[PDB]
């Protein structure tokens with residue numbers, strides 16, 4: 001006889017999918033989002049008169065769960081084509097900048113990536129069962145750098161692939177779990193071209209927030225915003241949920257979809273299992289930030305990688321024209337390498353790559369400083385993948401979702417949707 | 433004020449998915465199945481002490497819609513013994529058998545398939561928008577054989593790829609549309625290994641009928657069996673449905689999911705659009721059958737192609753052991769090439785492929801003789817794909833689904849589920 005059948009904590013894709021499932025099963029469903037907005041680690045905004053993406057945005061048809069949702073709600077794709085590049089750059093750890101032919105750049109990144117993932121089929125014949133093979137468990141003792149060191153790459157190739165893997169980690173590659181990379185590669189059909197097609201090619205028609213709103217409208221759930229959850233208590237065959245306004249909401253079941261790195265901010269009674277607490281203390285690796293830079297010059301279509309000891313790890317032209325100048329889209333692997341809110345430091349770092357340009361504006365999202373993400377995309381450290389079930393496992397009447405908890409595309413919208421579907425099923429099993 | 437909000441004609445995957453979508457939206461939903469069983473062109477049965485699939489059986493995680501359903505209902509995969517093969521054979525049109533080392537066999541089929549689909553990337557960059565490129569439309573004037581004739585393949589390679597394509601066509605390859613094959617290959621990540629992994633490697637835990645029953649139970653719809661629909665009339669802002677007896681059912685909308693080849697047996701008032709009538713007159717090509725053979729000997733893990741003038745076109749091990757012997761799963765492209773219900777002829781042909789074996793049992797399903805399939809899986813003839821919209825288009829309050837009508841994995845369970853999701857969306861738009 002509680003206030004709700006199910007309470008979903010978190011308004012990202014995982015929470016929205018869980019809420020849709022529970023609502024269409026007829027449960028009285030409430031969703032609590034801590035921010036004043038939905039989307040979580042997806043966030044569409046505007047800068048310098050244009051639309052920009054501060055978080056995740058890109059999807060693909062090889063990603064099963066989000067593609068099935070797009071079919072359900074009749075959403076197509078929007079191509080970010082990019083076409084030919086006018087300038088490809090690599091910045092080594094020592095700060096030196098080298099201009100390379102786009103063709104040679106692509107050839108070298110392909111050689112390095114295919115060497116890194118040469119054994120994806122043998123290790124992950126079932127990418128959605130990461131622990132299927134013993135080889136996966138054995139390789140979860142190795143870092144991405146451990147493998148890179150064995151590949152006999154050239155200096156250029158090594159710098160390129162290390163920059164790429166530091167981006168995927170949001171951290172230095174010596175800490176990055178190797179098997180998660182192989183597993184993502186395998187999810188893309190064990191093939192370089194197919195996987196690369198998923199990276200930054202297609203966005204959702206009507207936007208991530210469009211799909212989230214469609215799901216939440218379909219769900220019929222009550223949706224309360226700016227209501228952060230601070231504690232969960234299991235009692236009376238149910239749960240009590242406290243907000244930061246000391247309010248109490250009771251329910252038969254609760255689905256947690258908050259990012260792993262934020263669990264520290266929530267009290268649980270009874271305490272969570274030891275394995276879950278190990279995960280909660282560890283966190284996930286990524287410390288990334290996103291930055292858009294409006295410069296006066298028209299630099300055309302540019303792309304640059306910077307290795308892990310430098311700040312501007314992924315740079316690419318968002319838009320360009322003589323009147324506009326250029327908007328640069330920049331992903332920073334580790335926030336600590338640059339103060340994105342300092343225009344003089346940002347300008348110095350940008351000019352290191354593009355001499356003489358004048359910075360007209362900046363717009364940044366520091367995902368590590370946001371208390372409701374405390375980090376960016378999901379990136380497993382060494383040894384974490386093989387314990388992932390400890391995080392996925394239900395704890396009585398508390399269920400757990402989120403992209404970190406997915407088996408497939410765990411650094412993506414698709415993994416969040418997967419975890420939401422699973423959480424819906426688990427709610428149905430508990431409530432019948 | 434009709435008897436139901438929505439009536440779904442057909443108890444296959446498309447109908448079950450449409451019924452699940454409609455039921456979870458709260459519509460009063462009825463499902464009419466003409467057979468005494470559910471599953472349609474999937475059929476879970478038993479043979480030689482084991483569970484078998486007489487129709488569609490194999491799925492994959494690169495198939496978005498059915499994989500998402502499997503996640504929703506908590507179903508894993510069941511691996512058939514395709515890896516590490518002990519014997520790979522080719523039987524040419526003349527009946528001669530050539531045994532090849534499994535690696536050489538796989539290498540040659542890969543060479544032939546990727547040569548056939550060398551331009552899949554350029555022609556189908558968006559496999560779920562088949563008419564996206566002009567090249568796809570222009571190639572829809574060509575047959576699979578038209579291209580095979582340009583490839584200069586070796587004898588083994590040509591026989592392998594022609595057997596594969598005659599199986600997928602259910603017909604001789606001179607009639608098989610080229611673009612649909614390129615499009616399926618593209619759906620499989622544009623590479624042979626990944627595509628082949630999606631076709632005959634993994635089955636559903638608990639069976640196709642397990643997933644069908646899960647969806648239909650979730651839907652809450654009424655399910656009436658042995659009720660064939662003979663006519664549909666649009667009247668009074670709804671539709672009237674006549675059965676084979678004196679029953680009449682009124683509804684706000686009806687979703688037709690019966691196989692294309694059976695529409696000839698159904699009257700429509702008003703008559704359907706000219707394009708849809710053209711499709712209904714043409715039909716689709718497939719004349720396939722399925723056959724399971726239990727032999728006393730333990731053959732291990734076997735795989736064989738037979739070209740189109742022979743009956744045992746696709747052979748692979750279902751199960752094997754010293755006590756059991758072997759169960760062979762055999763897919764026949766054209767029923768007319770063998771009397772699957774005559775066990776002595778089946779034994780003769782099996783021994784033609786595997787000399788000296790002793791046949792303990794046979795179990796077959798002739799999909800072309802069933803009046804409610806009149807053919808097998810979906811196989812497009814020349815020129816049909818570029819007109820597929822004519823088949824997809826709603827006709828007032830009648831909606832059309834089924835694997836033939838899907839955009840992606842159209843020869844598969846996944847395409848059926850896709851069409852069911854689409855039909856759900858269209859019903860929601862019509863009824864609100």
Ligand SMILES: Cc1cc2c(cc1C)N(C[C@H](O)[C@H](O)[C@H](O)COP(=O)(O)OP(=O)(O)OC[C@H]1O[C@@H](n3cnc4c(N)ncnc43)[C@H](O)[C@@H]1O)c1[nH]c(=O)[nH]c(=O)c1N2
Pocket residue numbers: 009010011012013014015032033034035038039040041042054055056057058059199200227228229230257258259262265266288289290367372373375376377378401402403404410411412413414416
């Ligand atoms: C910069 C950047 C770039 C990318 C990506 C991420 C980022 C940060 N990703 C990943 C993608 O954005 C991500 O994997 C999913 O959006 C994760 O969504 P979840 O629902 O799992 O968590 P998410 O963080 O979205 O949802 C959690 C929700 O819970 C809320 N919350 C937290 N604590 C709470 C509390 N105590 N009480 C209540 N609510 C609370 C949060 O505010 C948030 O709304 C991506 N993906 C992709 O597919 N393509 C891409 O290109 C990228 N690139």
Ligand SMILES: Cc1cc2c(cc1C)N(C[C@H](O)[C@H](O)[C@H](O)COP(=O)(O)OP(=O)(O)OC[C@H]1O[C@@H](n3cnc4c(N)ncnc43)[C@H](O)[C@@H]1O)c1[nH]c(=O)[nH]c(=O)c1N2
Pocket residue numbers: 441442443444445446447464465466467470471472473474486487488489490491631632659660661662689690691694698720721722799804805807808809810833834835836842843844845846848
């Ligand atoms: C032997 C064989 C083998 C394979 C496959 C098919 C076959 C026949 N396929 C293809 C796959 O099985 C197929 O494409 C879909 O399951 C078709 O499902 P639909 O719902 O579109 O039609 P399907 O034919 O399944 O459903 C239509 C339903 O409508 C009913 N019906 C017909 N007329 C009616 C009437 N007048 N009134 C009422 N009901 C009526 C039928 O009885 C049937 O139940 C496959 N796929 C895959 O993914 N993996 C595989 O391995 C294979 N292999």
Ligand SMILES: CN1CCC=C1c1cccnc1
Pocket residue numbers: 490599600630631632746763809843844
């Ligand atoms: C996997 N699909 C879909 C259409 C027909 C097949 C098939 C392939 C090989 C053997 N039997 C059936």
